[PDB]
Amino acid sequence: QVQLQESGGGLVQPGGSLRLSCAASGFTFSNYKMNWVRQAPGKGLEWVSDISQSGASISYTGSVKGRFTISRDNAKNTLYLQMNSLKPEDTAVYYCARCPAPFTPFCFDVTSTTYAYRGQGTQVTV
Amino acid sequence: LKNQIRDARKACADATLSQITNNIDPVGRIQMRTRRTLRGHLAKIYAMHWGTDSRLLVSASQDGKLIIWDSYTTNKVHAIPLRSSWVMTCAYAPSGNYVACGGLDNICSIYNLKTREGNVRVSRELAGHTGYLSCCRFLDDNQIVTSSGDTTCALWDIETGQQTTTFTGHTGDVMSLSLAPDTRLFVSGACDASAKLWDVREGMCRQTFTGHESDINAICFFPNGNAFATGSDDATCRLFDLRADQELMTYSHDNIICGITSVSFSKSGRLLLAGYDDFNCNVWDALKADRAGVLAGHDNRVSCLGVTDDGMAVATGSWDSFLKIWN
Amino acid sequence: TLSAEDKAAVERSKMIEKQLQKDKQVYRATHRLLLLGADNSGKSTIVKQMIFETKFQVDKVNFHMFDVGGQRDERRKWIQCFNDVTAIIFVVDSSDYNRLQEALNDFKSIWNNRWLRTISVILFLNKQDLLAEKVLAYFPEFARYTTPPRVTRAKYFIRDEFLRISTASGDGRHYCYPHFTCAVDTENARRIFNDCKDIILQMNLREYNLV
Amino acid sequence: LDCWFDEDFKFILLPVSYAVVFVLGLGLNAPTLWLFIFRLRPWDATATYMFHLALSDTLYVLSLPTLIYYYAAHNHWPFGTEICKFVRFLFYWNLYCSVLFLTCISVHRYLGICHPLRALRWGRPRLAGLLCLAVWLVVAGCLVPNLFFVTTSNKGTTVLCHDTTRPEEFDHYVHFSSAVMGLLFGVPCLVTLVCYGLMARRLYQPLPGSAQSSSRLRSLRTIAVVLTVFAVCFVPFHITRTIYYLARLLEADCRVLNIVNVVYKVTRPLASANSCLDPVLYLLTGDKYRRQLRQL
Amino acid sequence: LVEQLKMEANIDRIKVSKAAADLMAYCEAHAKEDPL
Ligand SMILES: O=c1ccn([C@@H]2O[C@H](COP(=O)(O)OP(=O)(O)OP(=O)(O)O)[C@@H](O)[C@H]2O)c(=O)[nH]1
Numbered sequence: 001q002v003q004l005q006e007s008g009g010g011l012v013q014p015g016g017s018l019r020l021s022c023a024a025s026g027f028t029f030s031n032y033k034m035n036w037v038r039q040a041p042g043k044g045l046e047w048v049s050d051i052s053q054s055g056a057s058i059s060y061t062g063s064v065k066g067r068f069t070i071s072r073d074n075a076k077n078t079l080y081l082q083m084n085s086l087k088p089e090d091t092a093v094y095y096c097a098r099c100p101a102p103f104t105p106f107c108f109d110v111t112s113t114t115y116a117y118r119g120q121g122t123q124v125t126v
Numbered sequence: 127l128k129n130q131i132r133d134a135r136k137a138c139a140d141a142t143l144s145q146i147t148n149n150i151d152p153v154g155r156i157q158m159r160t161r162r163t164l165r166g167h168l169a170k171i172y173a174m175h176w177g178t179d180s181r182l183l184v185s186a187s188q189d190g191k192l193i194i195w196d197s198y199t200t201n202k203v204h205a206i207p208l209r210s211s212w213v214m215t216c217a218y219a220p221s222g223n224y225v226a227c228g229g230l231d232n233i234c235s236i237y238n239l240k241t242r243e244g245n246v247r248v249s250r251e252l253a254g255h256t257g258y259l260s261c262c263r264f265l266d267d268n269q270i271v272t273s274s275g276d277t278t279c280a281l282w283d284i285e286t287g288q289q290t291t292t293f294t295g296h297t298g299d300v301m302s303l304s305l306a307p308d309t310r311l312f313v314s315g316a317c318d319a320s321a322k323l324w325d326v327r328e329g330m331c332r333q334t335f336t337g338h339e340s341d342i343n344a345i346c347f348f349p350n351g352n353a354f355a356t357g358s359d360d361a362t363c364r365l366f367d368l369r370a371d372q373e374l375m376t377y378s379h380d381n382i383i384c385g386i387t388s389v390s391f392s393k394s395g396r397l398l399l400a401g402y403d404d405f406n407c408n409v410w411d412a413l414k415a416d417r418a419g420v421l422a423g424h425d426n427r428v429s430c431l432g433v434t435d436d437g438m439a440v441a442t443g444s445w446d447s448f449l450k451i452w453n
Numbered sequence: 454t455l456s457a458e459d460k461a462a463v464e465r466s467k468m469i470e471k472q473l474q475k476d477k478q479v480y481r482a483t484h485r486l487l488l489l490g491a492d493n494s495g496k497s498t499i500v501k502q503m504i505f506e507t508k509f510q511v512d513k514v515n516f517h518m519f520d521v522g523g524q525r526d527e528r529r530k531w532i533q534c535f536n537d538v539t540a541i542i543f544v545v546d547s548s549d550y551n552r553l554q555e556a557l558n559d560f561k562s563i564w565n566n567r568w569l570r571t572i573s574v575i576l577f578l579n580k581q582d583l584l585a586e587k588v589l590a591y592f593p594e595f596a597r598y599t600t601p602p603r604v605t606r607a608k609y610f611i612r613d614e615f616l617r618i619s620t621a622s623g624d625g626r627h628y629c630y631p632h633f634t635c636a637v638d639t640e641n642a643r644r645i646f647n648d649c650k651d652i653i654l655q656m657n658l659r660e661y662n663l664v
Numbered sequence: 665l666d667c668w669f670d671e672d673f674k675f676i677l678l679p680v681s682y683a684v685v686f687v688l689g690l691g692l693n694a695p696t697l698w699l700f701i702f703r704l705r706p707w708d709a710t711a712t713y714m715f716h717l718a719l720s721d722t723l724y725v726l727s728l729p730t731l732i733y734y735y736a737a738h739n740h741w742p743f744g745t746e747i748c749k750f751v752r753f754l755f756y757w758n759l760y761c762s763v764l765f766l767t768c769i770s771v772h773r774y775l776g777i778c779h780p781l782r783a784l785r786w787g788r789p790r791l792a793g794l795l796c797l798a799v800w801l802v803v804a805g806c807l808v809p810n811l812f813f814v815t816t817s818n819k820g821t822t823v824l825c826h827d828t829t830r831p832e833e834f835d836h837y838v839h840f841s842s843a844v845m846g847l848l849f850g851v852p853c854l855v856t857l858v859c860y861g862l863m864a865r866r867l868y869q870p871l872p873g874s875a876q877s878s879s880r881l882r883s884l885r886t887i888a889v890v891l892t893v894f895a896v897c898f899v900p901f902h903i904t905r906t907i908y909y910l911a912r913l914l915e916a917d918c919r920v921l922n923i924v925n926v927v928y929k930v931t932r933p934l935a936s937a938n939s940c941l942d943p944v945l946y947l948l949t950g951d952k953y954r955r956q957l958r959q960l
Numbered sequence: 961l962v963e964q965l966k967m968e969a970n971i972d973r974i975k976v977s978k979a980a981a982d983l984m985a986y987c988e989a990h991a992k993e994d995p996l
Contacts, residue, residue, distance in 0.1 A: 001337075028339070116318040116320075117319075150984070169480070169537060201462055203465070205469045230534060258530075317530065396987040513785070616874065630875065650781050657780050
């Protein structure tokens with residue numbers, strides 16, 4: 001039973017900072033690459049960042065790079081998102097997501113409308 | 127109340143197949159050699175099915191031709207052209223005079239074999255599915271149950287062409303189904319890493335088995351009818367018991383990184399044959415969680431696997447246009 | 454051995470095999486192309502300027518391009534049915550940057566797929582008149598970018614953004630072909646024809662013991 | 665009957681080169697010969713032509729040992745007339761069918777590279793099989809006169825096995841050999857050179873949008889190597905053969921006859937070495953590297 | 961979902977060892993007729 005749960009949001013100052021932590025259970029952490037999913041009001045499921053296996057490759061978004069830090073801990077079985085700089089246009093819900101293929105860097109369906117391995121994220125309000 | 131369900135599942139704390147069946151005779155190295163190589167198709171083989179007569183064998187490929195073999199003599203009895211070239215399911219009615227097919231066209235076309243005019247014609251078409259067909263199996267001469275990639279399955283009627291019952295409670299896309307030996311129940315594994323047991327007469331789910339961590343690709347009932355095996359994209363099979371409502375075995379290896387493409391059981395339920403995306407098959411022991419053989423004859427992939435009704439042979443397709451009968 | 458029924462069955466099998474051999478030439482001589490894109494991308498009008506399947510030929514070589522859209526917005530599984538297509542005609546709407554990020558991401562996911570890693574992708578930046586109108590009248594690397602006027606730099610910025618994935622992760626078994634199309638461009642059929650010609654040439658180089 | 669030729673400039677070179685070519689041919693052609701039938705059954709057009717060329721090379725090198733014995737025995741054929749006739753037919757039969765199979769593979773590559781879409785618009789392995797069968801039949805039919813021509817005579821030694829006909833019937837053999845040589849080399853040689861040059865010209869110029877790769881350079885190097893090997897193996901052999909046969913036909917002074925004899929007998933090992941150079945050229949590069957590595 | 965979980969709560973009515981023994985007895989009984 002793949003389950004994901006996020007925490008650490010809902011209190012941001014313009015230019016402030018917090019930290020996002022999603023917990024995982026029911027699957028091996030190291031064999032999968034996990035993304036970040038952003039859902040703004042009146043908008044579809046967006047994309048934020050990426051981490052590949054044991055942090056081999058790192059990718060961001062143009063509006064994300066330079067202010068967001070993606071961290072992961074295979075031993076602790078949790079994936080982190082550090083928020084350094086903020087603007088009031090990133091108030092959304094952060095879905096800690098992944099892709100079903102293990103030992104493969106193919107995250108084809110992550111931002112789908114319905115998705116089994118995408119936990120219910122935490123609200124972030126600036 | 128999922129915590130209560132997991133506590134009820136954990137109430138059977140002594141759940142270890144490696145201990146109850148530890149002191150048993152191992153099956154041993156199953157050395158199966160190719161007997162026939164039905165090299166008549168044009169492109170990737172996606173699906174195949176055996177007949178009740180245990181000789182005739184239907185198969186579908188990428189080129190859009192649905193062919194019917196005779197594995198005893200390696201003779202193409204029929205070759206039915208298809209309107210849509212992307213078909214990934216096959217069927218063969220127990221009466222033997224009907225063959226179904228389906229795929230990305232979201233239509234379960236049924237072709238009338240052995241008609242009075244001696245020709246193959248589309249007897250009926252079932253167009254009530256909003257997603258790509260994944261598996262269709264002939265319940266009888268009059269009913270067929272189909273599962274599509276639109277999260278729901280459906281039971282069809284040939285005379286009317288409309289669904290008699292539907293099974294809408296699922297997540298993800300249903301990937302394959304398998305009927306019970308009594309033909310009163312059936313099971314469906316989907317892309318939500320879960321498999322659900324359904325009742326044909328009532329049309330309601332009875333149990334859900336969430337043991338896998340990736341999309342379940344193939345699922346096949348145990349010959350006894352009270353179990354099944356699920357092969358998923360996590361490169362690991364599992365065996366689920368309907369009564370226990372909990373995974374029993376986990377046929378996983380460290381050197382296996384390619385997901386499962388097809389799963390079939392032998393006649394006695396002792397040998398679990400699993401097709402792999404690792405360029406070959408694998409012949410898993412049912413209750414030992416150890417390998418017993420490798421069918422490495424194929425040279426592209428393995429996409430379908432079927433065991434003959436009386437257990438006298440098996441047939442494995444491939445992404446090369448070959449069909450190898452093993453024994 | 455050879456009975457009356459057995460001889461008839463063998464003759465029927467030979468007739469079936471002859472029909473299959475006749476159809477093999479037709480199947481091998483037709484090129485199957487998968488049309489991919491987003492809702493805002495005008496992939497439909499690219500076909501209209503020549504599951505919904507279309508048929509067209511350029512130099513008596515028959516191309517059959519498929520625009521499947523009846524699925525439930527999940528393409529992990531049915532995208533494997535297009536493993537033997539000669540090319541992918543992934544179409545980008547380059548006039549919507551917020552959608553351009555998602556186009557970049559799913560082009561990357563298509564490029565890095567396990568089964569599509571050997572399938573060349575023809576890249577069409579569909580909306581270019583709209584892009585020219587928008588620029589003439591998001592990404593922080595645009596300021597620190599140099600042309601390999603403003604609309605040309607924007608066009609090549611998007612092209613290089615796609616080619617960054619098309620090059621840094623390519624295995625050499627497939628390539629991306631970027632093209633600049635419009636709403637009224639009528640050379641798309643010949644562009645796809647020439648790109649497929651080169652794709653088949655590369656497979657022929659690999660299979661002829663030359664590379 | 666005539667003025668004789670030099671001896672030690674051939675008896676010390678031809679047997680050694682022929683034995684080396686023989687052992688290398690069976691060391692390099694038999695494994696791929698069995699691979700092309702009962703390893704993975706490759707029988708598309710490319711593998712059809714490659715297997716037929718490998719079979720031709722095996723037959724060519726198997727035609728050697730009796731004539732290596734002939735050459736090392738200082739122009740002596742104790743075996744008999746029948747073996748002399750049959751094996752000096754088989755020598756040129758395998759040589760010319762190997763050249764024709766090289767030309768067939770060159771035309772196949774030209775069709776598949778210069779016009780690929782048309783090439784698989786009209787194409788079938790049945791055409792390749794029929795072409796190979798026609799090649800075997802045509803070469804055998806046109807070297808039918810070779811059986812009547814190669815004869816055994818007792819003139820200077822106890823037994824000679826004349827590669828040409830008897831000295832009293834050389835005017836027939838010069839015409840026959842010139843005809844078959846012109847056809848079964850010049851048309852294959854020009855066809856192969858034209859096709860390989862055209863494919864190299866196509867590969868040189870970068871046409872596409874972003875199919876820029878080192879494939880078009882590695883294939884160009886392979887094509888250049890193949891063309892150079894084919895030329896240096898076959899063109900000097902046939903050119904020296906023409907010069908020597910015309911020198912004998914004109915009945916010139918024995919000095920130029922000795923000179924052209926020496927150049928022909930030193931270009932002969934170059935022609936023989938193609939039976940060993942064909943596998944290490946056509947069976948190495950590409951997927952056959954992986955095939956041979958797996959089957960090793 | 962809560963209703964389906966409620967139905968699934970009342971269906972866990974067997975032991976794992978019983979299922980393992982039943983499957984073992986089934987393959988033992990039918991091993992004679994299995995050609996593989
Ligand atoms: O004018 C001649 C012609 C022929 N010969 C001698 O006749 C013998 C047979 O020579 P052939 O004329 O029968 O064939 P060839 O030129 O290809 O030479 P070989 O391959 O057989 O070695 C050779 O040993 C040659 O020296 C002469 O000495 N003078």
